[PDB]
Amino acid sequence: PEEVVIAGMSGKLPESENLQEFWDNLIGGVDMVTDDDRRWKAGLYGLPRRSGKLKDLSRFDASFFGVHPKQAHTMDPQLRLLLEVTYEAIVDGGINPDSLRGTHTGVWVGVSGSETSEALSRDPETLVGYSMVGCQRAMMANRLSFFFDFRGPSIALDTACSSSLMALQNAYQAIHSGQCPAAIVGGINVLLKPNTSVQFLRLGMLSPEGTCKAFDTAGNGYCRSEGVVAVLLTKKSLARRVYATILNAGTNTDGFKEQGVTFPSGDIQEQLIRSLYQSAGVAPESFEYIEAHGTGTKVGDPQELNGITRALCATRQEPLLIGSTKSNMGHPEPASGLAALAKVLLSLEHGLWAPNLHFHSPNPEIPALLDGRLQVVDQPLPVRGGNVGINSFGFGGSNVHIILRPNTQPPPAPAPHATLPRLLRASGRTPEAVQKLLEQGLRHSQDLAFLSMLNDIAAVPATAMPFRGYAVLGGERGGPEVQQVPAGERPLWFICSGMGTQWRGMGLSLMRLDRFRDSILRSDEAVKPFGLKVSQLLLSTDESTFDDIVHSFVSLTAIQIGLIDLLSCMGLRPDGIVGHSLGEVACGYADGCLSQEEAVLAAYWRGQCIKEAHLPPGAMAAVGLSWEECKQRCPPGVVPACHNSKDTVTISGPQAPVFEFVEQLRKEGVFAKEVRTGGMAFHSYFMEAIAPPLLQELKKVIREPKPRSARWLSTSIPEAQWHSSLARTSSAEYNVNNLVSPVLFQEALWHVPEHAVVLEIAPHALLQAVLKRGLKPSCTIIPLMKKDHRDNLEFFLAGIGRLHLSGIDANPNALFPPVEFPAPRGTPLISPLIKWDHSLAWDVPAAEDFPNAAIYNIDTSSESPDHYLVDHTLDGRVLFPATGYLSIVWKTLARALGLGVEQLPVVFEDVVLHQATILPKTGTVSLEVRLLEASRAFEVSENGNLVVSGKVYQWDDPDPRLFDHPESPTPNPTEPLFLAQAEVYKELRLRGYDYGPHFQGILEASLEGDSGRLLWKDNWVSFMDTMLQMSILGSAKHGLYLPTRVTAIHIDPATHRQKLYTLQDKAQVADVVVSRWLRVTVAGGVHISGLHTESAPRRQQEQQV
Amino acid sequence: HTGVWVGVSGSETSEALSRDPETLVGYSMVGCQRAMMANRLSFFFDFRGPSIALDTACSSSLMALQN
């Protein structure tokens, strides 16, 4: 059929936002599996701690994709990230997505989870309908088809851990058989619902250590990871970049396996590999790297690697390089295949195979690794050159395999046009995006393919990407320009300046452009018989070269026609043409009325006819007097020449009368100026004799008249007779009228529509001021060329860029020679270079949103987080702290209100401890906490028996004054001595309390026991227990007393953080004051009042006899 | 090489069976997972061909027929 290549590629993976960061983390070895607590508190349900989790899922540009704010809040995060990733994937290949709209492109998305639908579909009294319009699996591909206007198949297939490569294979089959000219294939996965991880742990697949130890001796399982990746596959014609060409790809299922459905098979995979590389016509020796599935299971790795050993290692001598991308980013279930594909493509691009982590000792069961036939990439290795294969063997039984032939297209040899500057137009959502694109383009200003691809994707409408920018790469005076396009289409008006503009050595610089050279050379051939060539005049060095009138005319018209050709090459059809003096002759070429040869002939004949006629020198002056004023003020023999502007006017006539009027005006002092016209009083009564011979010649010069489009706003014929029949067509009569009747530049300007993007097609922008002060002040003037400039090509490209900013889509690529494709290997990626409007945060399901009153299991084992409770032993039996219950109830209330504990200042009241819970040495005790928010009451229960009862409620108005230390009833001025930690706990030991190190937190205490210093670790239970201990210390009673009632407890975490002060060591401390008179214990942000303790009879175990 | 294409637009059994982490069993994934509708059939009948579970709603079955 037709060759299939991987055009685009992009996505987000664990701990990597763009594939550039992905490569940075791969090559540098940065492990991507993280222990953070983003998705859910690590260990909840005993799930393995580590897992690869994306950085953020709450970001999405709703406006760009046309999703209302309400719909965004009810959209699967996979879907939003996939829309962004697919857009980046298409543009990463240098293809504008609008170019694909309406084509038969297909979308095959791999997915195996719809948890967000379960989150949005739990409460039927409040669930909204459109939750299904953006969460159902079918909509994952259908949303892409809808936004991008893909008419091809929109299929979402699960395939059970092989979805990504299954979709890739289906897309490849589609493209091969000519069904689809392209295809967007993606793979998505997000860890949101812990129940899935619990299931996978029960099946015995997840690895307890959380590291997927691929090929190692001690592989236990695979660690779940997220990731969204998309790849654009297009036929060889549409491809602008080719990471690799998909030689072949197929699928097969393992069938009936005796060991069970989830026991992987080796013979089937070997058969698949052999069939693929036989049908593809590729000898096994060509292979240089095979991307093993490498899950890490003790069974999967041996089977898969032995299959590869039997399939590919049979005959080749040199070893086969085996890697596994799942040893870096973990294993995304559906997105596993595309993650490996991304790694392979990036490694191919950068010349080195990314190292494979967590491999130190090979699996004894896999003889290939022990021998030399099959080798692993443990440290970076260069790419010697060979085919690659990617395999994804899902746990259901579906197997896929893909063979890739890496692109090898070294950069082209240096070319003359490389030194020439280019143009870089960019567009983006926010100014940072355009600035990023411009800076990146400047970083690689010599990479022609990169510049061409960037230019191609920048032609997007203003509404989609309101910010634009153009940077001229290669020019010395080149700096980025960023601005906001005013939404709304704008007219593009051409103004061809008059015959007065011509300077020395004009257009030599711009000759370097092929189109300009072709235009000027065609003009040269046209002028041949008359005996002079335009190019020779331009390259001539005598100043008098442009002194000759006829040479001036011919050169000006030729250069203007060349500029028109350059602009036309990009695709700009003007919506209005205004011409001045000899500009009208070019205006003919602009409107299609006049052909190039006819224009050049007109210019030459005008020059010659003026030359032949002998008329006395006549100066042409400009008078700063209103038009009607110039109608009378001018002396006899002085006439209006051109109505340049409302203020500016041009006067022509004999040299003597013109000098007299200049003297008179200088007497008045009004502005007066006169351009150099060689004494040829143009547009005046002097030319009256010129026309007869001029008309006679021009009759033969221009053979057939033709219509004048409605665009062309003539200046020789006013509005009154503007309907005239002769004015209906260009002809010798037309040019004679143009020369005879005075110029009406002003009248033409009045009809320029508001917001017009004027272009000054002239070698020198002589009429810039006239247009600026004559047109409506919203007009934009962009002169293409200037005089005495060091390099006019930079100025012209800047003009085209400013045309880009105003809104007109002009592509500088056409100006320069076309670029050879596919792109050279090593062209920088484009996916990282696109930035979005992420100023808003959208919703995302929480862990509690799925099934799970609050039940807290107190496990005292060594690894459990509640180990510190073992140090709270009283009478030799470990008792739950009286402050442990309070922490549980506090956490329950915080969860109820949706806030955290640190952000919730709580107030207890009427706490009553009913029975003491003994924590078993081996086992667990389940404490259930129920709240009655209506009555502001709580009750902790144990096996249906009450343990703690009281009231809990949020502190609406915290007052830090409550925590000020009450003045002690005893001054204690001497303070000669104090009780240290060892002494205080010796005393408490003697009284019966046997606290261990964790509950040892009274750094010092006064002799009276009324003050001290409590150490602060993150544990609240220890802090409040230490407060209770400080209360007990000053008691004169003997024997151990345990809390039974507390009247009121206030906690204020903000004041708590304020009061803590770091000691001279690294440890923090909070001062504590006990006032028995007022029955208040205050320490940091905690304030206990009304503590009641009752003597608990000793256990009388008398273990000592 | 007979393949199995099943179009399915619901995994409601998984939601019910995976609600209590303190009692959920591993076999729920092997049985109630959406991708196991095709894989179970291929496993039983020894169908070595492709096994896919399409998810285009309201047209999944006829799309599987076209595939």
Is residue A728 part of an annotated ligand binding site? no
Contact partners, residue A864, CB within 8 Å, separation at least 6: none
Within 10 angstroms of residue A272's Cβ, the number of other Cβ atoms is 23
Distance CA A181, CA A266 (A): 35
Look at residues A673, A667, A668, A666 and name the one whose alpha carbon lies nearest to residue A651. A673
DSSP string, A860-920: -STTSTTGGGGG-EETTEEB--HHHHHHHHHHHHHHHHT--STT--EEEEEEEE-SPPBPP
Does residue B58 carry a catalytic annotation?
yes
Taking contacts as CB-CB distances below 8 angstroms, the residues of chain B near A177 are none
Whether residues B55 and A202 touch (CB distance < 8 A) is answered with no
- Token couple for A1015: 């150490």
Each as own residue / partner, the long-range contacts of residues A169-175 (CB below 8 Å, 24 or more positions apart, any chain) are A169/A249, A169/A250, A169/A251, A169/A400, A169/A402, A170/A108, A170/B67, A171/A106, A171/A108, A171/A233, A172/A4, A172/A233, A172/A246, A172/A249, A172/A402, A173/A249, A174/A106, A174/A108, A175/A1, A175/A2, A175/A4, A175/A233, A175/A234, A175/A235
CB A460 within 8 A of CB A96: yes
Amino acid at A572: L
Chain B's closest residue to A108, CA to CA, is B54
- Write down the H helix ranges in A653-709: 655-668, 691-701
Q: Token pair for residue A985? A: 């706990």
Phi, psi of A742 (to 5 degrees): -65, 160
**Closest listed residue to residue A478, CA positions, set A774, A727, A801:** A801
Q: What is the DSSP string of A550-587?
A: HHHHHHHHHHHHHHHHHHHHHT---SEEEE-TTHHHHH
Sheet holding A467-471, edge to edge: A424-428, A467-471, A481-484
Gap between the Cα atoms of A670 and A823, Å rounded: 62
| H-helix segments, A743-808 | 745-749, 768-774, 792-806
- Dig out the tokens for A433 from the structure: 């995006």
Structure-token match 């960037």, residue found: A454
Nearest to A195 among B4, B21, B55 (CB): B21
The residue written with tokens 């791969």 in the block is: A26
Cβ A811 vs Cβ A412: under 8 Å: no
Phi (first) and psi of residue A107, to 5 degrees: -125, 115
Distance (Å, rounded) from C-alpha A678 to C-alpha A320? 83
Please indicate whether, in this complex, the C-beta atoms of B55 and A155 are within 8 angstroms of each other. yes
Contact between residue A127 and residue A121 where contact means Cβ atoms under 8 Å apart: yes
> Among candidates A746, A759, A752, A751, which has minimal Cα distance to A641?
A746
Positive or negative: CA dihedral A1023, A1024, A1026, A1030: positive
> Which residues partner with A997 through β-bridges?
none
Q: Of A943, A881, A952, nearest to A911 (Cα)?
A: A952
Q: What are phi and psi of A231, to 5 degrees?
A: -140, 135
Quick one: tokens of A544? 């008098």
Query: Distance from first CA to last CA of chain A, Å, rounded?
Result: 94
Give A1086's contacts (C-beta < 8 A, 6+ positions apart): A1023, A1024, A1027, A1049, A1050, A1051, A1056
Spatial neighbors of A696 by CB under 8 A, at least 6 apart, are none
DSSP A512: G
How, if at all, do strands A757-761 and A712-713 pair? unpaired
Task: Given the residues B19, B26, B44, B58, select the one marked as catalytic.
Answer: B58
Instruction: For residues A228 and A78, give the distance between their C-alpha atoms in angstroms, rounded to a whole number.
Output: 7
User: Between helices A732-740 and A583-590, what is the axis angle to 10°?
Assistant: 140
Q: Could you write out the DSSP letters of every residue in A395-464?
A: SSSEEEEEEEEE---PPPPP-GGGSS---EEEEESSHHHHHHHHHHHHHTTT-HHHHHHHHHTT---TTT
Residue type, position A242, single letter: V
B44 Cα to chain A: minimum distance (Å): 6
Helix, strand, or coil here: A350? helix
Longest pairwise C-alpha distance within chain A: 144
**What is the spatial distance between Cα A1022 and Cα A1001, in angstroms, rounded to a whole number?**
8
Q: Which residues contact A913 (CB under 8 A, 6 or more apart)?
A: A882, A885, A947, A948, A1042, A1043, A1044, A1045
Distance CA A206, CA A216 (A): 16
Secondary structure (3-state) at A532: coil
Phi-psi region of A159 (alpha: psi -120 to 50; beta: other; left: phi over 0): left
Q: Would you state the structure tokens that stand for residue A907, as one six-digit string?
A: 């107030």
Q: What are phi and psi of A248, to 5 degrees?
A: -165, 160
Q: How far apart are CA A1073 and CA A1083, in angstroms?
A: 7
* Buried/exposed A593-626: b ≥16 CB within 10 Å, e otherwise: bbebebbbbbbbbbbbbbeeeeeeebbbbbbbbe
Q: Distance between CA A919 and CA A485 in Å, rounded?
A: 70
Look at A397 and B42 and tell me if their CB atoms are within 8 Å. yes
Q: How large is the C-alpha radius of gyration of chain A?
A: 42
Is A936 annotated to bind a ligand? Reply is no
The two most distant CA atoms of chain B are separated, in Å, by 43
Question: How far, in Å, are A223, A325, A510, A939, A1014 from residue A305 at the CA level?
Answer: 20, 15, 62, 58, 60
Half-sphere exposure of A954 (CA within 13 A, CB side): 17
Q: What is the resolution of this structure in A?
A: 3.3
Tokens coding A701: 């010069």
Does the annotation list A591 as a binding residue?
no
A522: Cβ–Cβ under 8 A, 6 or more apart, which residues? A596
Four-residue CA torsion sign, A864, A865, A866, A870: positive
Distance CA A1001, CA A1086 (A): 15
Residue in A closest to B11 by C-alpha: A114
Return left, alpha or beta for A505; rule: phi > 0 is left, psi -120 to 50 is alpha, else beta: left
Q: What amino acid is encoded at B67 in this protein?
A: N
Separation of alpha carbons A523 and A529, rounded Å: 12
Size of interface A-B (CB pairs under 8 A): 134
Output b/e per residue, A764-773; b: 16+ Cβ within 10 A.
Answer: bbbbbebbee
Integer angstrom CA distances of residue A308 from A168, A267, A269, A322: 21, 10, 8, 10
> How do beta strands A639-642 and A106-110 pair?
unpaired
Distance CA A462, CA A741 (A): 43
Alpha-carbon Rg for chain B, nearest whole angstrom, is 14
Q: What are the chain A neighbours of B56 within 8 Å (beta carbons)?
A: 138, 141-142, 154-156
Amino acid symbol at A940: V
Indicate the residue of B9, B21, B39 with minimum beta-carbon distance to A138.
Answer: B9
- Whether residue A328 contacts residue A24, with contact meaning beta carbons closer than 8 Å, is answered with no
Tell which residue, A148, A196, A1022, has the closest CA to residue B32: A196
Which residues of chain B have a CB within 8 Å of the CB of A142?
A: 56
Q: Which two tokens stand for residue A683?
A: 């547009």
DSSP state, residue A371: S
Count CB neighbours of A444 within 10 A: 15
Note if the bond before A822 is cis, omega within 30 degrees.
Answer: yes
Rounded CA separation A356/A252 (Å): 28
What residue ranges in A236-356 does DSSP mark as E strands? 244-253, 287-291, 320-323, 352-353
The three-state secondary structure class of A16 is strand
Contact predicate A42/A201, CB 8 Å = no
| A429 assigned ligand-binding residue | no
Spell out where A674-761 has E strands: 706-707, 712-713, 729-730, 757-761
From residue B32, how far is each of A140, A207, A371, A849, B15 by CA, in Å?
Answer: 21, 23, 42, 21, 9
Q: Which residues of B touch A157 (CB under 8 A)?
A: 52-55
Count CB neighbours of A721 within 10 A: 10
Cα–Cα distance list, A658 to A610, A616, A643, A812 (Å): 20, 13, 17, 46
Q: Which residues make beta-bridge pairs with A743?
A: A642
Residue with tokens 């579906």: A398
Cβ atoms within 10 Å of A1080's Cβ, excluding its own: 18
Tell me the helix, strand and coil percentages in chain A, rounded to 5.
35, 20, 45
| Residue among A45, A116, A137 with most chain B CBs within 10 A, to mutate | A137
Structure token pair of residue A22: 């992905």
DSSP states of A961-1019: GGGSPPPPSS--------EEHHHHHHHHHHHTB---GGG--EEEE-TTSSEEEEE--S-
Q: Find residue A1043's DSSP bridge partners.
A: A1093
Residue A556 in contact with residue A574, Cβ under 8 Å? no
- CA-to-CA distance for A1104 and A768, rounded, in angstroms? 109
Token pair 């990504």 is at which residue? Answer: A164
Tell me the nearest-neighbour CA distance from A136 into chain B, angstroms: 8
Bridge-based pairing of strands A906-913 and A1041-1051 is antiparallel
Tokens 């500057």, located at residue = A421
Q: Which residues contact A779 (CB under 8 A, 6 or more apart)?
A: A752, A754, A755, A756, A757, A758, A771, A772
Distance CA A605, CA A759 (A): 27
Crossing angle (nearest 10°) for helices A19-27 and A336-350: 70
Measured at the CA of A999, the angle between CA A994 and CA A1004, to 5 degrees, comes to 95
